[PDB]
Short mmCIF file of C-alpha atoms in Angstrom, two decimals:
data_model
loop_
_atom_site.label_atom_id
_atom_site.label_comp_id
_atom_site.label_asym_id
_atom_site.label_seq_id
_atom_site.Cartn_x
_atom_site.Cartn_y
_atom_site.Cartn_z
CA UNK A 1 0.00 0.00 0.00
CA UNK A 2 1.16 3.53 -0.85
CA UNK A 3 0.44 5.03 2.56
CA UNK A 4 3.03 7.81 3.03
CA UNK A 5 1.16 10.30 0.87
CA UNK A 6 -2.57 10.03 0.27
CA UNK A 7 -4.34 11.52 -2.74
CA UNK A 8 -8.08 11.91 -3.30
CA UNK A 9 -10.54 14.20 -5.09
CA UNK A 10 -13.70 15.55 -3.40
CA UNK A 11 -16.10 18.07 -5.07
CA UNK A 12 -13.40 19.44 -7.45
CA UNK A 13 -10.82 19.70 -4.65
CA UNK A 14 -7.64 17.60 -4.97
CA UNK A 15 -6.36 16.66 -1.52
CA UNK A 16 -2.73 15.62 -0.92
CA UNK A 17 -2.27 14.33 2.62
CA UNK A 18 1.14 13.72 4.20
CA UNK A 19 0.60 10.52 6.16
CA UNK A 20 3.90 9.60 7.87
CA UNK A 21 2.18 9.79 11.25
CA UNK A 22 4.83 7.97 13.31
CA UNK A 23 7.63 10.14 11.84
CA UNK A 24 5.61 13.40 12.13
CA UNK A 25 5.87 13.93 8.37
CA UNK A 26 9.60 14.58 8.57
CA UNK A 27 10.89 15.39 5.08
CA UNK A 28 13.14 13.35 2.82
CA UNK A 29 13.66 13.17 -0.94
CA UNK A 30 11.32 10.13 -1.28
CA UNK A 31 8.31 11.78 0.37
CA UNK A 32 8.90 15.00 -1.58
CA UNK A 33 9.12 13.07 -4.87
CA UNK A 34 5.72 11.48 -4.10
CA UNK A 35 4.36 14.98 -3.49
CA UNK A 36 5.72 16.21 -6.84
CA UNK A 37 4.01 13.39 -8.74
CA UNK A 38 0.64 13.76 -7.03
CA UNK A 39 0.76 17.55 -7.40
CA UNK A 40 1.48 17.17 -11.13
CA UNK A 41 -1.51 14.83 -11.45
CA UNK A 42 -3.81 17.30 -9.68
CA UNK A 43 -2.57 20.26 -11.74
CA UNK A 44 -3.26 18.33 -14.97
CA UNK A 45 -6.61 16.82 -13.90
CA UNK A 46 -9.55 18.72 -15.39
CA UNK A 47 -11.71 17.31 -12.54
CA UNK A 48 -9.67 19.36 -10.03
CA UNK A 49 -10.15 23.11 -9.55
CA UNK A 50 -8.45 23.62 -6.16
CA UNK A 51 -5.47 21.83 -4.60
CA UNK A 52 -5.03 21.32 -0.85
CA UNK A 53 -1.82 20.16 0.86
CA UNK A 54 -2.55 18.83 4.35
CA UNK A 55 -1.29 16.32 6.88
CA UNK A 56 -2.38 13.60 9.28
CA UNK A 57 -0.98 13.05 12.76
CA UNK A 58 0.27 15.62 15.28
CA UNK A 59 2.36 17.75 12.93
CA UNK A 60 2.29 19.18 9.43
CA UNK A 61 6.05 18.51 9.31
CA UNK A 62 8.29 18.33 12.38
CA UNK A 63 11.48 18.85 10.34
CA UNK A 64 13.86 16.68 8.32
CA UNK A 65 13.85 12.89 8.56
CA UNK A 66 16.75 11.66 10.71
CA UNK A 67 17.72 8.79 8.40
CA UNK A 68 17.81 11.18 5.45
CA UNK A 69 19.80 13.72 7.49
CA UNK A 70 22.50 11.16 8.23
CA UNK A 71 22.63 10.22 4.53
CA UNK A 72 22.77 13.87 3.46
CA UNK A 73 25.61 14.67 5.91
CA UNK A 74 27.76 12.33 3.80
CA UNK A 75 26.72 13.68 0.38
CA UNK A 76 29.15 15.43 -1.95
CA UNK A 77 28.28 18.95 -3.14
CA UNK A 78 26.97 17.54 -6.44
CA UNK A 79 24.84 14.93 -4.61
CA UNK A 80 23.49 17.73 -2.41
CA UNK A 81 22.55 19.80 -5.48
CA UNK A 82 20.51 16.89 -6.92
CA UNK A 83 18.90 16.24 -3.54
CA UNK A 84 18.05 19.93 -2.95
CA UNK A 85 16.44 20.18 -6.39
CA UNK A 86 13.75 17.71 -5.26
CA UNK A 87 12.37 20.28 -2.78
CA UNK A 88 13.32 23.05 -5.25
CA UNK A 89 11.24 21.53 -8.04
CA UNK A 90 8.33 20.79 -5.69
CA UNK A 91 8.14 24.37 -4.44
CA UNK A 92 8.50 25.75 -7.96
CA UNK A 93 5.75 23.46 -9.22
CA UNK A 94 3.42 24.57 -6.39
CA UNK A 95 4.11 28.25 -7.16
CA UNK A 96 3.53 27.71 -10.90
CA UNK A 97 0.12 26.01 -10.46
CA UNK A 98 -2.53 27.91 -12.46
CA UNK A 99 -5.09 26.47 -10.00
CA UNK A 100 -5.55 27.84 -6.44
CA UNK A 101 -3.32 26.11 -3.88
CA UNK A 102 -4.02 25.89 -0.13
CA UNK A 103 -1.80 24.61 2.70
CA UNK A 104 -3.59 23.36 5.83
CA UNK A 105 -1.23 23.40 8.81
CA UNK A 106 -1.65 21.75 12.22
CA UNK A 107 1.05 21.42 14.89
CA UNK A 108 4.69 21.99 13.93
CA UNK A 109 5.72 23.14 10.45
CA UNK A 110 9.49 23.30 10.85
CA UNK A 111 11.93 23.78 7.95
CA UNK A 112 10.76 22.64 4.52
CA UNK A 113 7.17 22.30 5.78
CA UNK A 114 7.02 26.00 6.69
CA UNK A 115 8.19 26.69 3.14
CA UNK A 116 5.28 24.72 1.67
CA UNK A 117 2.84 27.08 3.43
CA UNK A 118 4.60 30.04 1.78
CA UNK A 119 4.66 28.46 -1.70
CA UNK A 120 0.90 27.89 -1.67
CA UNK A 121 -1.44 30.80 -2.48
CA UNK A 122 -3.24 30.45 0.84
CA UNK A 123 -2.30 28.90 4.17
CA UNK A 124 -4.76 28.03 6.93
CA UNK A 125 -3.41 27.23 10.41
CA UNK A 126 -4.94 25.75 13.53
CA UNK A 127 -4.52 27.96 16.61
CA UNK A 128 -1.94 25.50 17.99
CA UNK A 129 0.26 25.50 14.83
CA UNK A 130 3.90 26.60 15.18
CA UNK A 131 6.51 27.51 12.58
CA UNK A 132 10.30 27.66 12.45
CA UNK A 133 13.13 28.20 9.97
CA UNK A 134 15.63 26.17 11.98
CA UNK A 135 18.52 25.86 9.48
CA UNK A 136 21.04 28.24 11.07
CA UNK A 137 21.04 26.08 14.22
CA UNK A 138 22.63 23.34 12.07
CA UNK A 139 25.02 25.68 10.29
CA UNK A 140 22.75 25.58 7.24
CA UNK A 141 20.60 28.17 5.42
CA UNK A 142 16.94 28.05 4.29
CA UNK A 143 18.02 28.62 0.68
CA UNK A 144 15.41 26.72 -1.32
CA UNK A 145 12.37 27.97 0.57
CA UNK A 146 13.63 31.53 0.84
CA UNK A 147 12.14 33.12 -2.29
CA UNK A 148 8.65 31.94 -1.27
CA UNK A 149 9.03 32.95 2.37
CA UNK A 150 10.41 36.41 1.47
CA UNK A 151 7.52 36.89 -1.01
CA UNK A 152 4.92 35.84 1.60
CA UNK A 153 6.09 37.76 4.70
CA UNK A 154 8.55 40.30 3.29
CA UNK A 155 12.33 40.67 3.52
CA UNK A 156 12.32 42.28 6.99
CA UNK A 157 10.43 39.50 8.80
CA UNK A 158 12.03 36.72 6.77
CA UNK A 159 15.55 37.97 7.49
CA UNK A 160 14.75 38.11 11.23
CA UNK A 161 13.29 34.62 11.42
CA UNK A 162 16.08 33.08 9.30
CA UNK A 163 18.77 34.64 11.51
CA UNK A 164 17.12 33.78 14.85
CA UNK A 165 15.64 30.35 14.02
CA UNK A 166 12.96 31.28 16.57
CA UNK A 167 9.70 29.36 16.79
CA UNK A 168 6.68 31.52 16.01
CA UNK A 169 3.05 30.71 16.74
CA UNK A 170 -0.01 30.65 14.47
CA UNK A 171 -1.08 34.16 15.58
CA UNK A 172 2.36 35.47 14.62
CA UNK A 173 2.27 33.61 11.29
CA UNK A 174 -1.13 35.23 10.67
CA UNK A 175 0.06 38.76 11.54
CA UNK A 176 3.00 38.28 9.15
CA UNK A 177 0.73 37.01 6.35
CA UNK A 178 2.38 33.57 6.15
CA UNK A 179 -1.08 32.26 7.00
CA UNK A 180 -4.31 34.06 6.11
CA UNK A 181 -6.69 32.14 8.39
CA UNK A 182 -6.24 30.91 11.94
CA UNK A 183 -9.03 28.58 13.06
CA UNK A 184 -9.92 26.24 15.97
CA UNK A 185 -7.84 23.04 16.19
CA UNK A 186 -10.69 20.52 16.14
CA UNK A 187 -12.35 22.03 13.05
CA UNK A 188 -9.30 22.80 10.89
CA UNK A 189 -10.23 20.13 8.32
CA UNK A 190 -13.90 21.12 8.18
CA UNK A 191 -13.01 24.81 7.74
CA UNK A 192 -10.47 24.03 5.02
CA UNK A 193 -12.74 21.72 3.01
CA UNK A 194 -15.56 24.28 3.05
CA UNK A 195 -13.25 27.14 2.13
CA UNK A 196 -11.68 25.17 -0.73
CA UNK A 197 -15.15 24.12 -1.95
CA UNK A 198 -16.23 27.78 -1.99
CA UNK A 199 -13.32 28.73 -4.25
CA UNK A 200 -14.02 25.64 -6.43
CA UNK A 201 -17.57 26.90 -6.92
CA UNK A 202 -16.56 30.32 -8.20
CA UNK A 203 -16.31 30.67 -12.00
CA UNK A 204 -13.30 28.54 -12.88
CA UNK A 205 -11.76 30.64 -15.66
CA UNK A 206 -12.37 33.86 -13.70
CA UNK A 207 -10.61 32.35 -10.64
CA UNK A 208 -7.57 31.33 -12.70
CA UNK A 209 -7.53 34.63 -14.57
CA UNK A 210 -7.70 36.54 -11.26
CA UNK A 211 -4.67 34.64 -9.98
CA UNK A 212 -2.80 35.49 -13.19
CA UNK A 213 -3.94 39.14 -12.94
CA UNK A 214 -2.69 39.64 -9.36
CA UNK A 215 0.65 38.10 -10.34
CA UNK A 216 0.91 40.30 -13.45
CA UNK A 217 0.09 43.68 -11.94
CA UNK A 218 2.35 43.17 -8.91
CA UNK A 219 5.34 45.55 -8.90
CA UNK A 220 4.39 47.13 -12.27
CA UNK A 221 4.25 50.90 -12.64
CA UNK A 222 0.65 52.14 -12.50
CA UNK A 223 0.67 54.17 -15.70
CA UNK A 224 -1.69 54.76 -18.63
CA UNK A 225 -0.39 51.62 -20.38
CA UNK A 226 -1.38 49.47 -17.39
CA UNK A 227 -4.78 51.19 -17.03
CA UNK A 228 -5.58 50.45 -20.71
CA UNK A 229 -4.36 46.85 -20.33
CA UNK A 230 -6.61 46.27 -17.30
CA UNK A 231 -9.63 47.83 -19.04
CA UNK A 232 -9.14 45.61 -22.11
CA UNK A 233 -8.83 42.55 -19.86
CA UNK A 234 -12.24 43.07 -18.22
CA UNK A 235 -13.79 44.09 -21.57
CA UNK A 236 -12.69 40.72 -22.98
CA UNK A 237 -13.91 38.82 -19.90
CA UNK A 238 -17.35 40.48 -19.97
CA UNK A 239 -18.03 39.11 -23.48
CA UNK A 240 -16.51 35.68 -22.76
CA UNK A 241 -18.90 32.72 -22.56
CA UNK A 242 -18.24 32.43 -18.82
CA UNK A 243 -18.72 36.15 -18.12
CA UNK A 244 -21.95 36.18 -20.12
CA UNK A 245 -23.19 33.11 -18.25
CA UNK A 246 -22.28 34.64 -14.91
CA UNK A 247 -24.07 37.89 -15.69
CA UNK A 248 -27.15 36.11 -17.04
CA UNK A 249 -27.32 33.85 -13.96
CA UNK A 250 -26.96 36.81 -11.60
CA UNK A 251 -29.56 38.97 -13.38
CA UNK A 252 -32.02 36.05 -13.62
CA UNK A 253 -31.27 34.72 -10.11
CA UNK A 254 -30.31 31.30 -11.51
CA UNK A 255 -27.43 28.90 -10.83
CA UNK A 256 -24.44 29.46 -13.17
CA UNK A 257 -23.52 26.50 -15.40
CA UNK A 258 -20.02 26.03 -13.98
CA UNK A 259 -21.72 24.61 -10.88
#
């Protein structure tokens, strides 16, 4: 049985569940390779609109797997490059998903696991969740996760937390925008499934286009060129089949055909 990483689809939501309960989902290249494959499947499955990364057991990910760490300590630089590109490709693939991505975090998310929350569009934490970029304690650096963390929480906060390796709680992760929702422990799953379903029931092209739009306008000069571009984008969407359906459904008080 393939039991380390579970994959199922519910109501247009693809759910990847880290399931190394006894090892607290501690990362190694094997688990991360499984994640890459399942993520690729979900991204390419027309039956999936929203992707959720979640975990069973006490912790989202307690850190790095101890067997893997001993192996990695003996790697050459070239072997380390290959190994690091497993996480590197996973995080890149998450960030490149045209579909909405959500991380659901309970307990500890230490190291790579904290990075997964940053790579996803949205992260939802239970009140008891805790985060840490622990690498400097080992004489290492959080290199692979850093672009995603710096994007999510900003250079100032990221620099602090990388240098200190301090543990920060779910409230702190929320105030820093690493997570956007902080919800009761015993209903984390229920909240997440409902929230993902709500996004999956919005107009699917509009949702994907809105993701692309936010990404595109970010850090561009707000000039007349950009204004004209944005106006043409909505003009095109209004006459699209989906936009016309959405408007008709709203004006007639009927259910849109994408649901």
